[PDB]
């Protein structure tokens, strides 16, 4: 957030947090999983050829 | 946990280890001890200007 994009005319700074929510979040929001209707995650495994 | 915390853990175990000479000799760390280093941090703003 504290990243510096530009410095302004009145002298104030343009921080990245000024022009962006900055949050921790998924690389993708493609998969949403659920065990018995409850919040979940998992990894399915695919046995290697042979 | 991070380096520091592990380094503690390690010492705990390593100290607790070396107080049973009855059974366990030369319990040592195989790696290296932390050391000093000279960090040349840049002021971003400053460079911009």
Kindly determine whether residue A7 and residue B44, on different chains, have CB atoms separated by under 8 Å: no
User: Do residues A4 and B45 lie in contact, with contact meaning Cβ atoms separated by under 8 Å?
Assistant: yes
User: Do residues A31 and A44 lie in contact, with contact meaning Cβ atoms separated by under 8 Å?
Assistant: no
The kind and range of the H/E element at A38 are: strand A38-40
For an interface test with A, give the residue of B42, B43, B48 to mutate (most A CBs within 10 A): B48
Kindly determine whether residue A4 and residue B49, on different chains, have CB atoms separated by under 8 Å: no
d(CA B35, CA A14): 37
d(CA A27, CA A30): 9
Q: What resolution (Å)?
A: 3.0
Pick the closest to residue B3 from B34, B49, B48, B39 (CA basis). B34
d(CA A21, CA A30): 20
Method for structure elucidation: X-ray
Chain-centre distance for alpha carbon B45: 33
């Amino acid at each position: 957030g504290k990243i510096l994009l530009k410095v302004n005319q009145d002298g104030s700074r343009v921080l990245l947090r000024d022009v962006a929510k900055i949050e921790l979040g998924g690389e993708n929001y493609d998969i949403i999983a659920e065990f018995n209707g409850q919040p979940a995650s998992g990894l399915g495994i695919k046995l290697a050829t042979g | 946990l991070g380096h520091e915390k592990l380094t503690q853990a390690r010492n705990q175990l390593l100290a607790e280890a070396a107080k049973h000479p009855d059974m366990l000799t030369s319990v040592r760390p195989n790696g290296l001890e932390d050391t000093p280093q000279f960090k040349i941090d840049i002021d971003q703003e400053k460079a911009q200007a």
